[PDB]
Symmetry: D2
Subunit: 187 residues, 4 copies
């Protein structure tokens, strides 16, 4: 009788790397039973997708340390009319850069700041998905997600997104403690 959790994975990309991340995020979210997922490229996406979403993952290549101009334009110009009337959606960020130390966490930060501006509740993930591999401000990779931990970081983002949607909008209050006390979250 409750609805499924509604998750939007929306991404820009230059080479496809962020698309490969986006697919893994989306798979991450679908893995939580009773979560529904829409996966869109920015040129495909509509203001109605966002209205539909309980939770959003927004991905961009790291372009000069920041969200891409096409993702920025979508928020500024397409979502601009919705601004002020869509507060309290849940959102996170992800990004692929040319290199480690190349600004993928900073690009994530700029996605998050854009999302916060719309009054969304934003988050990153504490989970260690590899011994030295995490996603505190969003899922980040240099190039394509190739390694097991890189693929898993992407999945974990969508997973946690779907879980926060499930806890806070669907009201599965019981999942909070399950997650907090789960030893698998730390490799």
């Amino acid at each position: 009788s409750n609805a499924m959790g509604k998750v939007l994975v929306i991404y820009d990309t230059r080479t496809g790397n962020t698309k490969k991340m986006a697919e893994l995020v989306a798979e991450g979210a679908r893995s939580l039973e009773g979560t529904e997922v829409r996966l869109k490229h920015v040129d495909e996406a509509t203001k109605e997708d966002v209205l539909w979403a309980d939770g959003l993952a927004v991905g961009s290549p790291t372009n000069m340390g920041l969200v891409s101009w096409k993702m920025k334009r979508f928020f500024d110009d397409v979502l601009g009319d919705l601004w002020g009337e869509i507060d309290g959606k849940i959102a996170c960020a992800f990004s692929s850069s040319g290199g480690w130390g190349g600004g993928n966490e900073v690009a994530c930060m700029s996605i998050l700041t854009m999302l916060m501006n719309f009054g969304f509740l934003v988050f990153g993930v504490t989970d260690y998905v590899g011994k030295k591999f995490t996603l505190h401000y969003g899922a980040v990779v240099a190039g394509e997600p190739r390694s097991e931990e890189e693929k898993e970081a992407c999945r974990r983002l969508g997973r946690r997104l779907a879980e926060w949607v499930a806890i806070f909008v669907d009201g599965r209050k019981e999942l909070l403690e399950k997650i907090r006390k789960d030893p698998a979250r730390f490799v």
Copy 2:
């Protein structure tokens, strides 16, 4: 059975951020059934954070950033809870010496720190004066004296209480009421 647990925790150099923190707490208390705990960092405990559904965290802007004492609180007393208190709701506020002085950047640093714990973090869209808002947290230069500054501080607490009510306490009817409320924009 309307219910909610809010911690306003703050640090201060000259007391300006205490003044804000009192207004934040009173904004949170304005939502019926919301218990608020107001603490200086020196008296705050691990347990206050465990008790809270939602946190408002204040600091003076000290070189663009959270104060070292507030940083130390998070690094060293909350450090033991790191990894198991994910999902608390949190927001930020700051008093700086001046406009253009880094209060929004200090708010970013607070939010960075809270996100590190797995908290869901927000600012406020609401315009509280015609040219006065709080997108990344409540910010003032010096003491909150104008009615705008005071109301921005109150509003942060409100929205915090509201988000706890909607998302923790399960009060879904408030969401659309907030979204469509004309009074949110002066």
Copy 3:
């Protein structure tokens, strides 16, 4: 006596343009400084190559540089990446409200500029009693007050000075600025 300063800006409503004009004036106020003032639509990669120092201005759009400004950097100046390191740059921004993200927008401009290997800065000066520009000049709406207009001037003025000291080698200025009491109002 020598300096090349480029002030480049985006504007939707005219507000940031008003700021840019004052930034430029501030830069010109320093003797021997040549200044170009360009909208992003008329700016070229040869402008950025000509410049010793840059002041880059955008409206605060969702707390960040506008998408038009971002396109310009990604698409036109992109080809210059890796070969223009060491240019000197700073930021400015007009937003809809105080607490609306103007320092964060500046941060995002500086982030972009640092990616080009630029040396990047803000200004310590108190141009008014509770008015400064630590991360760039910031205003809510149009710069109308005397503090606001001077905040913009001072950014332009400090860029010109950094270029005069660091490119043109006028080391004597450095200490003059460091000890100048006029820098802090009151």
Copy 4:
């Protein structure tokens, strides 16, 4: 008239990781002819060191996404009295974190923020030091710098600082163009 480069490398560390970075940052800085370099833990650094320096490299463990509380305490409480009168120093940041995607670029950003507040001219490095390895907001590593690229990112940070000190303070402007066109900068 024979003035030269004064570079201070100031660091905090809790397990030694950032100290190992700091040592390599200092090695890198010393590689440029006529660069004098001080290397100092925060616990032993003074305000005289900061006054002495043309250039600074500031390093900290990534702690909750930010500079050390000890490093912060040193700027607020011992360097604060210099605020407003040391504008125009040249400075950069470096950090070691527990994991990739763990906030090291953000920690660096927080250091740069602090340094900018002092009126310093602040930078990162475009140079690629491995195929997918760079240092755009400062040198970053998860753990101890152990691989060749991780060690060379640390060195390169110190190198570029010394280079900026040489070009911008000590007048040696022939170097700008040599650095600007150097193919070695991109592995």
